[PDB]
Write a protein that binds this ligand. Structure first.
Ligand SMILES: CCC(=O)Nc1nc(C)cs1
Length: 164
């Protein structure tokens, strides 16, 4: 199963790890992608997960968008996990760098509650511009299912743990 995770709460765990490497190692039932509303997996976690699937995630995502239109900020969709997981839950957290409402971060985390266990990144953190400390607090106060958080940045991981 998941290994080397520090327990933060009854249901939230955290590890300093690259989510792609965690997914290849564990092959979880659900890997969360930090998606945008268009499912254009260019950078950050999205670009890295898509690259690990050899672009299969992007082709599937483009077919989903062509059929259904874009997601909402705070929304999600379940697609294939390809070689990384059974499923990929593409969750859209607000992108603060685009002036998207930070209160939608709680809505984005609520999508995790539809799944018993997930491997996930901190939503809206990194290139999305939100404060990762705030993202972890919203995560622990919103998610009731088992979430295994993979934080890529070591210095960020230490700050998140020491300030929790
Ligand atoms: C290039 C690989 C990469 O960006 N990996 C990332 N893992 C996380 C958890 C965020 S970004």
């Amino acid at each position: 199963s998941f290994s080397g995770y520090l327990k933060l709460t009854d249901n939230v765990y955290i590890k300093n790890a690259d989510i792609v490497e965690e997914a290849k190692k564990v092959k979880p039932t659900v890997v969360v992608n930090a998606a945008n509303v268009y499912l254009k997996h260019g950078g950050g976690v999205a670009g890295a997960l898509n690259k690990a699937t050899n672009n299969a995630m992007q082709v599937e995502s483009d077919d989903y968008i062509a059929t259904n239109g874009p997601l909402k900020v705070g929304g999600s969709c379940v697609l294939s996990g390809h070689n990384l997981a059974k499923h990929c839950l593409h969750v859209v957290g607000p992108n603060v760098n685009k002036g998207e409402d930070i209160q939608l971060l709680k809505s984005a985390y609520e999508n995790f509650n539809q799944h018993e266990v997930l491997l996930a990144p901190l939503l809206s953190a990194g290139i999305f511009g939100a404060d990762p400390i705030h993202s972890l607090r919203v995560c622990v106060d919103t998610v009731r299912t088992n979430v295994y958080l993979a934080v890529f940045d070591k210095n960020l991981y230490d700050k998140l743990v020491s300030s929790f």
